[PDB]
Amino acid sequence: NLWVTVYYGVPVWRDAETTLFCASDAKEKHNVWATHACVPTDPNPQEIHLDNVTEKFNMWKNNMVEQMHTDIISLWDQSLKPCVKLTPLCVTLHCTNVTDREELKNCSFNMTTELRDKRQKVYSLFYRLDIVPINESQGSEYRLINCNTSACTQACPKVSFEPIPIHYCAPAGFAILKCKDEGFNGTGLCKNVSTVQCTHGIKPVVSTQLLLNGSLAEKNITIRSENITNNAKIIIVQLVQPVTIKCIRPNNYTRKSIRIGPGQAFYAMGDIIGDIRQAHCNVSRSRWNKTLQEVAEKLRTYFGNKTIIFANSSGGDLEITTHSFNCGGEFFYCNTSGLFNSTWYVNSTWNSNDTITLPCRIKQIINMWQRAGQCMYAPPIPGVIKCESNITGLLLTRDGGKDNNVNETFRPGGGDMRDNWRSELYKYKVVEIEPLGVAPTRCKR
């Protein structure tokens, strides 16, 4: 006969959910992500390739993207908790034009001081986007935006917004399965599986309509979507060639600090050196629209021989209608209409610098995670700032037309913030290993 035997350490697993902890090369100026407070990453992480193994992956039903979203939001609130809260800034502002160039406003207002029995009159420039008119005095009285919803917290100037890579590790007794299949679209059975204890360096680069400093495709422009035929689902496309984009804030402001209360001060922009200049972003036209042809032809495989048309975002909030990012301190808002403006036929070919210039707007009062209230005030960075980014992906949205036409339009959709993390975690899935196994054998001989 046969007897039942139990095995310990069997190599099996199941889908599960667990509390993943951070891991990074600790070392120094703190950052908003508090990476210095997590476990230090190992110098030679182990990665094992599972031979003969095939596993099913679902980037849209993954829990890592959802768990990471909560952690990023929690860290953002934790970093802003000890900083000064700008509650006295909600005062009547008297603004005038700076001595289009109406992007800035020279506002003057009353303010408190360390002495409770004394006040002070100060002045400081303010971007027009972060100002709302009261309308009682028409065009000479204003107030800070979102002042009627919550008091924004000034970001601590000692912490930087640099998105250093952070590795997501699983606790003992669990593992992170990695898919090494070439050109995997993020869904289905992976024919080349691998395992690792921690994910690669994930840079929490917050962006909209364009993935910056993200991973690059291996051999071909990959497209991902849970239902490509659907209209409400966002389309994630990964590029193979990183399209370099150079942004700059030519204005040279003078940072001025005013003590609004005992032991706390408010930082604002003083006068501008030189003259006003519009912020913008440059990108090579030859290399940029060349990728559009490759992106268009790749998209053509999912829609027959129809032509591909790129149009600017329909309209709505500034966060979703403009390419938002951050040059390590200043939040940009650039109009991508100069990029997604073309039509590509089935035989169309793209065929000097001629760099495309994208005008950009800047805001100080910002809501990162589209939450009501909980706003943050970004202090100004002194001097001119420049940041170069690697465009490795795009967030597209398909219009919901009749679809019987000979063409189909695509728009740069902001989607959800989770899409930024999902573009990097599509290759991972957490599983719970079951070391206990049971199998029969002719034992007791």
């Binding site: 035997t5 139990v6 095995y7 094992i48 952690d71 199998a439």
Partner: protein, 127 residues
């Protein structure tokens, strides 16, 4: 010699020679700030210990503590699986076997528990 969990694709007969590599990794700053990252690490550390003890306690009551492989007195009921002793060990793998016995895993666990307990009281406790 493959690394951790590297024998997942090999057959059941060949995957059992690396049991120690998977069993060893079941549990692998002194201060704690209890922040966002600290709280997650604390839960992960506590969760890892519980998972290890959850499976270790079963081996303890089964009388197989400290053994990577052990045979019990519960005979194999063909109703659970009619696979032959050849294809099950030399052709089929553990991952495919986990989904077949998952329906009867709980019943087998209880059977092994009372079998060991009855045998313990039968041999020991002379009077």
């Amino acid at each position: 010699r493959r690394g951790f969990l590297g024998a997942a694709g090999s057959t059941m007969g060949a995957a059992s020679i690396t049991l120690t590599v998977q069993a060893r990794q079941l549990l692998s700053q002194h201060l704690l700030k209890l922040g966002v990252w600290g709280i997650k690490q604390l839960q992960a550390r506590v969760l890892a210990v519980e998972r290890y003890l959850r499976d270790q306690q079963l081996l303890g009551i089964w009388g197989c503590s400290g053994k990577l492989i052990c045979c019990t007195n519960v005979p194999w009921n063909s109703s659970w699986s009619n696979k032959s002793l050849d294809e099950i060990w030399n052709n089929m793998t553990w991952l495919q076997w986990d989904k077949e016995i998952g329906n009867y895993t709980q019943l087998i666990y209880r059977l092994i528990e009372e079998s060991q307990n009855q045998q313990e009281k039968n041999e020991k406790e002379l009077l």
